[PDB]
Symmetry: D2
């Protein structure tokens, strides 16, 4: 039998960093959860009990804290690239590093209509993530994403004209609620190395901001023919705004809100144009995905 693939490392490493401006006294915090998995010439640790090739996962954890202490942790695309590059340069037998970072929100509080210097609030569970794969001799591949962005529109969503056969009971509709949790990922063109990633630093935050803005505006303004149609419009726009992106992927659940027929009770009217009270459904849910690239 043989080892076809192997990777190992440390997951769920929580890190917080504070930056203090001695001038203004203003403080800014960053909190993330980091995972680093390594690959290389490590097969013998599995096959011959040879631990000599293993950089202990505890040491990988130490390295994450040390790297955060000596480098900026934002944007996460840069921090991930520095961290991944460290491992492949430091250890001759390690040839790839896979770094996943989830950034948690700590938004500056406004007290009395004005930004507080050192107090923050977690406004929603939405995350900004990055996946960075640093492979010796093959550069740096970065996928950036936003996830956990939950939205709902109460009208201006339709779903009619779908295939109807002997398995179909769903009625066509011209006015429904649409609600989803957005997961959007944009994949960057391959970078030759850290120097190239550093040269594009300003584009990272800007592109995340654009992806978020296009998602929200399109969802709110599109008179949606389907989740499929609306998501394609979002991806099209993002690709048009940033040339250094190769593909955009969206994965959207369709979280159903059902009408409740109350006519059995005193002829109460609560369906169609009279629908006011709905039952949110926890499961099942539609799941719609698409990856859009350049023609």
């Amino acid at each position: 039998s043989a080892v076809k693939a192997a990777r190992y490392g440390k997951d769920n490493v929580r890190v917080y960093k504070v930056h203090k401006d001695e001038k203004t006294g203003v403080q800014t915090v960053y909190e993330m959860t980091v995972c680093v998995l390594l690959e290389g010439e490590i097969e013998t640790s599995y096959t011959k009990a040879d631990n000599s090739v293993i950089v202990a996962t505890d040491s990988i954890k130490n390295t994450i804290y040390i790297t955060a202490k000596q480098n900026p942790v934002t944007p996460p695309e840069l921090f991930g690239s520095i961290l991944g590059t460290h491992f492949i340069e430091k250890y001759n037998h390690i040839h790839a590093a896979h770094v996943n970072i989830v950034c948690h929100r700590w938004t500056r509080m406004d007290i009395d209509g004005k930004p507080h210097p050192h107090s923050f609030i977690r406004d929603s569970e939405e995350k900004r993530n990055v996946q960075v794969d640093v492979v010796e001799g093959k550069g740096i591949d970065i996928k950036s994403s936003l996830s956990g962005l939950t939205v709902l529109k109460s009208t201006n969503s339709q779903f009619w004209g779908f295939l109807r056969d002997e398995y179909t009971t769903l009625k066509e509709t011209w006015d429904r609620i649409l609600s989803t949790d957005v997961d959007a990922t944009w994949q960057w063109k391959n970078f030759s190395g850290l120097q190239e990633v550093r040269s594009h630093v300003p584009k990272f935050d800007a592109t995340w901001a654009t992806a978020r803005e296009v998602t929200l505006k399109t969802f709110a303004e599109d008179n949606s023919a389907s989740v499929q149609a609306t998501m394609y419009k979002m991806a099209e726009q993002i690709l048009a705004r940033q040339q250094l992106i190769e593909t955009v992927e969206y994965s959207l659940p369709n979280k159903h809100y059902f009408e409740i027929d109350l006519s059995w009770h005193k002829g109460l009217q609560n369906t169609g144009k009279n629908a006011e009270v709905f039952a949110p459904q926890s499961d099942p849910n539609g799941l719609i995905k698409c990856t859009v690239g350049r023609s």
Copy 2:
């Protein structure tokens, strides 16, 4: 053996309601999760298999939807009072109704710097809750609360001068991170019945807004001597601003962020005044509670 206490009903009933202003075309959504438990002369369903005294939990579910269709669902203090009163008036053998409502956030989206008519975003998992106990002949007792409000301040929190004995290892500090998830509850004076609850309707939203504002401002501005001291200041203020509140209760976890000593690595300085990178601790956590009333 005998039945000392008994209650039964329906939990986890998800409800959504939309209000449409035909004039402006503006739509407003409300989403909540409701639990209703009843008490009364129902012992025989337990002791003699007598189902005749049971209002089926499925019927309680129907009743929640019907009541939401025919009444306003906001503020939740009023909706809960209407729902609880319904059961005790409708069924002669039911003498108490206990209604718990959790309101989920659906905040109107701003697109292009302006409120969208029918699109919403879930901004944080913070909840506004109510517990309403409607007891025949004893009026209506309402406890209102906010929970899941997660905040952090990066400085201006101290903890020194605590008891030191042979079980103590904790070092005193004059500058630490303070982070918590706020759970605050204000208990209203007993109301004689629905008419009295209706007479105070405007105070409900106003008091929730005040509780939230006082919590956030006090947390941000207090140079905290301890969680105990800071929380007492919050409760004091709320009681001073609303006479119809009898008590205010706070329950605050102390979510620890530990310094990381990196001196073993090239003499790197990351403790005390040089602390920049911290390790958030998932567990254990301090838990501090207090109930403040009027003297």
Copy 3:
């Protein structure tokens, strides 16, 4: 304003202890999650920023580990009583200790049809818990419980003869699925102090075993007229088997499994006597409670 009630302490303290029999070489592990909250003359920490009265929550954490090192951790009723008694005896101004312990399952593995000396498996998420309140001058009050015991029976459950009115749509049934997650609590007679708790040590594990056995056998064998009726039969039996219990409380969700009408598809028969495929409902759920004591 005044402090009406106050308690503080450490939550989510995970503890593991191993016992090694040098004779047989057999090892036994115990893993629990502990919470300790104290009450006493501590108001001034809230009102005057006086930390001198505070036993730091970090010290409470240290104390839990030290106590587990020097005492048996089983049965949890005894360990909780020792831990709570420690605080009220040690600190003159602390007058009550509230200890909650959740015991996690680590069941010895059987390899080749025989008990392994030092390997264990977590067989289900069911917990054994205790709540111990040690109050100066008022003895020790112990509530023991089992929770997270999930069961289902596919027939021999009925529900008919309930109240029918204009809010009712539910059909009567003589054959349905019954599924629930059992939460059962038995409250012991008050104990005068540690000496008395030690004198009854053998009854703790025995009573937990009896409660579990009676719950499982009654659920399996009762031709259930309702959740209410079946749960009362369980509580009756437990009270009859252990005199030192004052009350037994059960809290049971009714986790619904709905029939699916497939007749619209080629006249397929899947309801009533022909029901084979069902849809488990995640929410809402019935919730039925009862506390049974001695007449």
Copy 4:
């Protein structure tokens, strides 16, 4: 811009099925959660708002229930293959179906030392899963797995001889606790179609049983040199026992239990050979993976 990849369908479809033996009166239940995603000539639903190519996700849900009603649901490898084949044969423009099934445990209860005919218990949260990809013209690819199997051994695990450099603080050890949640996947040789899957039906349950048995025995009996070494031994054995498996993949977290130094308290000895009380760590955790195939 162009559609590079697209898939859509229904997730989180809960299904329960009961089988009743009219002879013995014995009943057997199966409960699963199913996800089906389709691919094919559906780009125009995204690009031109053409819903005519969409088999509604609600219809996919109906199809899952109908298929479960007319076919056996066990082993899940067969049920998944039937369900996936249905879509590609039924709809000319659908060319691939991806079916994921999670099977939940409902284990027959033993009452009075004997199997009950219709009562079951959920013994642990461990799952048996399958992923089936049915691709037109390319056969059926099946990956089977077990996950959520949580185990711990209190001794007979070592970790020494790993790389030591300026990032290393971890001490070598010859006796530690090892605990993990096992996720094991075995990938079958490609099958030409349903007929071939049906011909191997008996191997599915047998191979799952073997994978589970080999995992448990190896974990318990190996004097582990590392997680890497122990997991490789498991995969080797499974491959040797079933020729129709091409690869075996394991993904194992290393859930740390730390020693607690209590020497600061009255010289208490709780480290090394005297270690009895440990602190389970919720995060971070090592994560070790490997895919083993045939040489």
